[PDB]
């Protein structure tokens, strides 16, 4: 909620839509007057073949994993099987049930037992080769976000453990010490971090806008925290410790290089993510509680307009 | 592995037994050769009955849970509903499938929908009033240990955060300083925490065994650690910084009191759980890098033998 | 009674719901009007199926627990059987009664095999999941909650050791000081969110540290209770350190202890501290608890408690 | 005379003083005591200086 464009955490609208659809199907089934028993022999058997599809896709997925076992799966075969087939004991019954359900269930439409394995494997291999059963980008982001496999989440936490977690416990003492020597505006006790969404980070801050000008270097294992003041038509409307977010600077440099495999669109994906991750780490943080605030924006307006409203 | 009587975390032998039972049931069902359509329909209707009974039980629970909305569930109806009925959308789908597969599919063994609902309500009411369907202590212990629902977990983590994490770093420096000055054997550089599983903590450590004798208290927020010299057949084989585990004494005192409702069997279970939790925490702790060594013993033997063998 | 948001001990509204459902069931059975022998037979067979399912689940649990026998059951198979199957005699009698009714009332073993397969499926997948409300109810009834242990250890280790001499030390300081006077009660602060700063000034500038109470050694602090810039009260403020421990527990990932878990355990810690200190011999109006949560003026609440 | 601000800056620190007349500012400047005038004073305190009060005032006039 820091910015109109920062993504929201994934809601349950998707499953809520499945409940919408599931009502329609049950109404349709009783609406068509189809024999209820024949309905059950198809939902289970069709899902039985679908669950048998993962076994064949698992073996194809497994054959490559057997060469990483000394390095990736700490030399254990159980981890190798667990990574490709999920929980073994959970999937062990579903395979036996799929075998038993198919081995005996009468089927108005459906191959016999030996004909089942013939057709099922061919589709599994064809999908692998053609990539037809690929991952949609919308669900690639959803799985990565839920699994926290994002370069942004790594940068945000490193930015916290390395830098913010170390200075903030002693920034209040350092700011209180600084204010005890100077008397005017007022130096805010909250650290300020600029978050240009498009990863546009100049090397210095005084080049960003003339309204923000350098004042002094806050006294300090050496942390050069540059305090700045704001200009509101020739008057200091506020002074605060405003700095850039180094990870957002490196994120821009990440996309430029040709060996990073980091697309221009991907940079915007992990630039908005870094702000939200840094929003919620500080919210629960003990040191960064009522001690820091973030300035997130996107230049299409002046920067100094946003800084003042946060003071 | 501190003592043979400290339990290991619950494994997945229950799932293995479930797999064995499923295989045996499948083999028996195939051997007897009953019509598979009957098998499938009966199994589906049984699952439907179980799900609907769970729904009615959850409704009975939610009836009292309506008065807890403002306090225990932060005043939102949907959180209360999820707490009573589990996953809202998943349970909705399962119950809709149960409703369809009962109101449409036939059932030789099973009432009509209204009379089935009456019977199910009666059974749920009886199971709630008489508590006939209840959790055996094994499931309760398993759920508590998986979800960390134990007083021992709290005592162990409090012991780590409050006391151990604030002395283990400086204890090595204190021991080195005390060894540099007093050249009168040698002092071990690790604190040897005692964990009496019987929860018998006397005021004097020398009264546990005459061989353990109070030699000195190590010089120093005010932590007083007493080092004890160890007599092997009347000869001092050495010395080490030794002390009891206060949370075990507090556990015994809790057991004595009449408001804890914390019996001797429960006291022993939580004592062993606390010892295991402390072992795990100290093993994974970054501060305790070979800085402390737990000595868990149960009186069935001289403590001097065990402490020396660890020295 | 401690605070509006503190969860009350679980009441018997569930039994009210059970009575309502029982009345509705009796009314509808009377209305439909079917031979009651068939209803009784179906009910008894349903109970027998439930008992057989419990037997299968207990057998699986026992197959799990057989390897814990030398640490959880003193090497006695009887304790393992009782743990996995409830009360031994009662459960055995129930099982034989259910099996006898199963054999008596009008496939015989095929039904049992199907029931066993269904039980195995429920064990593996987990459709017979434990609702979080019922988990909390069982934990509170049996007192397996972390907050229970934390509060009881806080009582045995810290509160019970200093309350009997706190009033004497306060009186000594009262002779040492003169006109205001410090109250003879300990005011333990219990922030529900468990966010405790190191010093009260950071939490609230309206509260000023005054002095340390005279003195294992125990150090306590007396705080100025400023109001409108004037001194309005003096009482001993001391954060409940177990709440700080709970926050640190929720911080680390090895605790398996979520944020809502921390909040609920904070509420239970406050409520069971109320229960301990309500009837304790060492609590004779020399200790008063403060519980609040910022949606704030702590000093206003403390003065209201004075 | 009240301390108002420190002039921005080897390393030196100077103060600007709010010259108040009738409770209102009449002017501003940078005031700075002569630090030797302390050293001449702290000689007179010490018995090793051989530098008495009559000499302290007499010399501080020359300085
Ligand atoms: C069992 C009590 N309890 N249950 C819960 C839940 C919370 C507390 C609790 O907090 N009690 C507490 N709070 C105090 C505050 C002050 C003060 N003036 O501030 C002084 C006190 O008395 C000295 C305080 N006490 C009592 C003694 C406390 C700490 N302590 C412990 N703790 C445990 O064993 C234990 C058991 C469980 C379970 N969890 N823990 C860890 C918390 N072992 C010790 C052994 C030695 C020794 N052999 O030398 C010296 C100790 O004290 C020096 C530390 C002083 N520090 C402590 C905190 O920070 C500020 C001051 C020891
Ligand atoms: C949901 C519904 C009605 C449906 O739409 N189909 C698609 C479909 C066919 F597959 C086959 C014919 C018609 C339709 Cl119409 C389906 C299939 C089954 C089934 O049992 N398939 C066995 C099976 C295969 F047919 C091919 C294979 F490679 C493996 C395999 F294991 C059950 C229910 C359905
Ligand atoms: C696995 C098998 C054969 C089995 O063992 N039972 C237990 C049982 C009874 F519950 C009821 C009668 C006989 C048996 Cl024998 C069962 C039940 C159904 C079923 O559809 N039950 C609906 C249903 C009821 F019948 C009564 C009720 F109060 C609620 C309710 F929701 C299907 C298959 C089985």
Swiss-Prot record, chains A, B:
Keywords: Autophagy, Cell membrane, Cytoplasm, Cytoplasmic vesicle, Disease variant, Endoplasmic reticulum, Golgi apparatus, Host-virus interaction, Immunity, Innate immunity, Ion channel, Ion transport, Isopeptide bond, Lipoprotein, Membrane, Mitochondrion, Mitochondrion outer membrane, Nucleotide-binding, Palmitate, Phosphoprotein, Transmembrane, Transmembrane helix, Transport, Ubl conjugation. Changing residue 162 to S: Slight decrease in c-di-GMP-binding. Changing residue 260 to Q: Abolished translocation from the endoplasmic reticulum in response to cGAMP-binding. Reduced phosphorylation by TBK1. The modification Phosphoserine is found at residue 224. It is a multi-pass membrane protein. Its main location: endoplasmic reticulum. Ubiquitously expressed. Expressed in skin endothelial cells, alveolar type 2 pneumocytes, bronchial epithelium and alveolar macrophages. A lipid is attached at residues 84, 87 (S-palmitoyl cysteine). It is found in: Endoplasmic reticulum membrane; Cytoplasm, Perinuclear region; Endoplasmic reticulum-Golgi intermediate compartment membrane; Golgi apparatus membrane. One of its GO terms (biological process) is positive regulation of DNA-binding transcription factor activity. It holds the Pfam family STING_TM. GO terms for cellular component: autophagosome; autophagosome membrane; ciliary basal body; cilium; cytoplasmic vesicle membrane; cytosol; endoplasmic reticulum membrane; endoplasmic reticulum-Golgi intermediate compartment membrane. Residues 149-311 are annotated as: Cyclic dinucleotide-binding domain (CBD). Changing residue 133 to R: Does not affect amount of ubiquitination. Changing residue 16 to R: Does not affect amount of ubiquitination. 3',3'-c-di-GMP binds at residues 158, 163, 221-224, 246. Phosphorylation by TBK1 leads to activation and production of IFN-beta. The phosphorylated pLxIS motif constitutes an IRF3-binding motif, leading to recruitment of the transcription factor IRF3 to induce type-I interferons and other cytokines. The phosphorylated pLxIS motif facilitates SENP2 recruitment during late phase of viral infection. Phosphorylated on tyrosine residues upon MHC-II aggregation. Changing residue 249 to I: Renders the enzyme sensitive to 5,6-dimethylxanthenone 4-acetic acid (DMXAA) drug, leading to activation of the STING1 pathway. Residues 1-13, 66-87, 131-311 are cytoplasmic. Changing residue 250 to A: Strong decrease in c-di-GMP-binding. InterPro entries: STING, STING_C_chordates, STING_C_sf, STING_LBD, STING_TM. Belongs to the STING family. PANTHER family: STIMULATOR OF INTERFERON GENES PROTEIN. It is linked to STING-associated vasculopathy, infantile-onset: An autoinflammatory disease characterized by early-onset systemic inflammation and cutaneous vasculopathy, resulting in severe skin lesions. Violaceous, scaling lesions of fingers, toes, nose, cheeks and ears progress to acral necrosis in most of the patients. Some patients have severe interstitial lung disease. This is Stimulator of interferon genes protein. It comes from Homo sapiens (Human). The lineage of its organism: Eukaryota, Metazoa, Chordata, Craniata, Vertebrata.
């Amino acid at each position: 909620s820091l910015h109109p464009s920062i993504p929201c955490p994934r809601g349950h609208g998707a499953q809520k839509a499945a409940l919408v659809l599931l009502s329609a199907c049950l109404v349709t089934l009783w609406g068509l007057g189809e024999p209820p028993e024949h309905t059950l022999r198809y939902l289970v058997l069709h899902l039985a073949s679908l669950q048998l599809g993962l076994l064949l896709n698992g073996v194809c997925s497994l054959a490559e994993e057997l060469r990483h076992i000394h390095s990736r799966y700490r030399g254990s075969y159980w981890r190798t099987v667990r990574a490709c087939l999920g929980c073994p004991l959970r999937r062990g019954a579903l395979l036996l049930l799929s075998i038993y359900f198919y081995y005996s269930l009468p089927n108005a439409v459906g191959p016999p037992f030996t004909w089942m394995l013939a057709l099922l494997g061919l589709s599994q291999a064809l999908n692998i080769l053609l990539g037809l059963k690929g991952l949609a980008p919308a669900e690639i982001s959803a799985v990565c976000e839920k699994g926290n496999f994002n370069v942004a989440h790594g940068l945000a936490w490193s930015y916290y453990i390395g830098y913010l977690r170390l200075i903030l416990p002693e920034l209040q003492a350092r700011i209180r010490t600084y204010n005890q020597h100077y008397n005017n505006g007022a130096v805010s006790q909250r650290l300020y971090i600029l978050l240009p969404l498009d990863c546009g980070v100049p090397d210095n801050l005084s080049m960003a806008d003339p309204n923000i000008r350098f004042l002094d270097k806050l006294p300090q294992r050496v942390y050069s925290n540059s305090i700045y003041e704001l200009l509101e038509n020739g008057q200091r409307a506020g002074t605060c410790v405003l700095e850039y977010a180094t990870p957002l600077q490196t994120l821009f440099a990440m996309s430029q290089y040709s060996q990073a495999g980091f697309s221009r669109e991907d940079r915007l994906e992990q630039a908005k993510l870094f702000c939200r991750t840094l929003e919620d780490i500080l919210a629960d943080a003990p040191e960064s509680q009522n001690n820091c605030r973030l300035i997130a924006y996107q230049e299409p307006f002046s920067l100094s307009q946003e800084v003042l409203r946060h003071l």
